[PDB]
């Protein structure tokens, strides 16, 4: 599907270039703006201007597109051409790996965690169970990004 249902802004908190397999890929640490998520990535950083980080908008508005809402014959246009992956700076598939969220024993971890591998990139995430919007192993594998829009 492309059936919504989540979008949020971030601010980079730290950058961690440990393992330069490619100079343009680094670990990052981020915090979301509209809500309360705590995030780690290992991701292409050439999207950012230089060293410093910047504010993103991650989206798990589902993408679609294994099938034929676009492979029908469109997806050639103004989704690209003068537009780009810029209306959606990046977009990819992956695998979520996760328990019930809890690993405390009894506090029933008030933030559901998530771990994601996506196109060879990685994330490590925490947020409230409803708020993370990814109870399933198969929801936030649908993954999309852009700059902030302000």
Curated annotation (Swiss-Prot):
Keywords (A to Z) from UniProt: Acetylation, DNA-binding, DNA-directed RNA polymerase, Nucleus, Transcription
Highest taxon above the source species: Eukaryota
Presence of the UniProt keyword Acetylation in the record: yes
GO molecular function, one term: single-stranded DNA binding
Gene3D superfamilies reported for this sequence: Nucleic acid-binding proteins (2.40.50.140)
Residues modified as N-acetylalanine: 2
Cellular component per GO, a single term: RNA polymerase III complex
Annotated stretches, region: Non-specific ssDNA binding: 16-40
InterPro entries attached to this UniProt entry: NA-bd_OB-fold (IPR012340), RPABC3 (IPR005570)
Annotated localization: Nucleus; Nucleus, Nucleolus
GO biological process, one term: transcription by RNA polymerase II
Signal peptide: none
Family per similarity comment: Belongs to the eukaryotic RPB8 RNA polymerase subunit family.
Assembly, per entry: Component of the RNA polymerase I (Pol I), RNA polymerase II (Pol II) and RNA polymerase III (Pol III) complexes consisting of at least 13, 12 and 17 subunits, respectively. Pol I complex consists of a ten-subunit catalytic core composed of POLR1A/RPA1, POLR1B/RPA2, POLR1C/RPAC1, POLR1D/RPAC2, POLR1H/RPA12, POLR2E/RPABC1, POLR2F/RPABC2, POLR2H/RPABC3, POLR2K/RPABC4 and POLR2L/RPABC5; a mobile stalk subunit POLR1F/RPA43 protruding from the core and additional subunits homologous to general transcription factors POLR1E/RPA49 and POLR1G/RPA34.
Reported function: DNA-dependent RNA polymerase catalyzes the transcription of DNA into RNA using the four ribonucleoside triphosphates as substrates. Common component of RNA polymerases I, II and III which synthesize ribosomal RNA precursors, mRNA precursors and many functional non-coding RNAs, and small RNAs, such as 5S rRNA and tRNAs, respectively.
Protein name: DNA-directed RNA polymerases I, II, and III subunit RPABC3
